[PDB]
């Protein structure tokens with residue numbers, strides 16, 4: 600019987616099995632939720648090998664009849680979204696619009712984190728740091744980044760509990776939501792009041808006849824895809840980083856006292872983060888040797904990020920947060936190679952600012968329920984608790 604993936608929906612603790620698997624079988628046959636076979640890769644060396652070799656293709660994971668990690672929740676072409684962006688001549692533009700350096704942006708993040716936190720302090724403990732802090736901070740950020748009205752955020756957010764499912768079967772709601780969100784974005788592109796952020800930029804490139812080969816659909820897809828990827832990734836990461844920090848009171852206290860180390864703290868929280876529920880999928884486009892396995896053309900490979908990130912061969916004392924590591928950014932939390940996360944800078948600043956605000960307003964933050972009372976979302980592309988009850 601094949602080892603089934605994923606092993607655990609819990610985002611607070613790495614299963615003991617990962618260390619077992621990594622040492623003895625850093626590439627191992629598994630079965631996914633669709634019933635497909637796959638190669639799960641779990642050492643830093645093999646994970647990096649896979650991500651650095653472009654013949655392990657992201658685009659081709661959408662190929663018809665390919666073994667699948669999970670059901671598509673987007674059109675097959677949209678799996679190649681970053682490639683379409685590059686081909687449309689929109690790459691450095693997209694990347695420029697999603698940098699945290701934008702005028703006023705970091706102060707907006709800061710003031711938004713502090714306002715959310717003041718509201719929670721007024722309502723009284725317990726507070727839910729996912730639904731009433733991390734996710735709203737993520738959503739407010741991405742509305743600003745995209746240049747769309749803040750009041751439009753909640754509804755785009757609504758789609759995400761389905762869009763980012765990791766399902767054995769197709770999801771009818773995913774298509775309905777996708778089509779509505781695409782239509783919304785299309786409308787944003789023609790709205791002359793939208794002059795800032797990613798959509799403001801994309802909108803004026805759309806008016807340019809030099810971009811006449813670029814469909815309206817792709818422009819709109821970029822907005823929907825970046826909003827969703829950024830909101831789900833930042834909100835989910837911050838949420839489970841807060842659990843990591845809460846469980847390490849002396850770290851909490853150290854960062855509160857020495858906020859200059861908060862970036863180093865966040866980098867370690869990224870390294871040990873369990874937010875990705877599944878390995879990153881790739882399809883082999885050739886026969887390629889990975890460890891003791893010849894991966895065959897057409898086979899699915901899953902790059903287990905926490906495999907690499909907890910690998911003591913690369914990170915000594917891997918379960919420990921150490922702020923003085925010599926190569927602290929070398930984890931795979933943002934991936935590697937061709938598909939390295941284009942939002943990584945913004946991801947770091949969202950978490951840095953969110954944590955700094957929280958530590959200053961709630962220096963005594965702690966869980967308000969036993970950790971085993973958290974409800975872990977299942978069959979989802981991220982590991983998150985439904986609610987994160989705290990007191991302070």
Ligand code: HEM
Pocket residue numbers: 657680681682697824825826828829830832833836837879880931932933934935937938939940941942943945946947
């Ligand atoms: C802590 C926050 C974040 C984490 C941990 C994270 C993680 C990742 C990872 C691991 C990948 C690589 C996927 C792969 O190679 O298969 C990725 C790619 C991606 N991320 Fe992020 N991400 C974060 C924030 C963001 C933000 C803020 C945005 C946009 C606003 C974003 C947009 C994207 C997009 C569009 C891709 C696909 C790139 C491609 O296909 O080439 N992410 N992210």
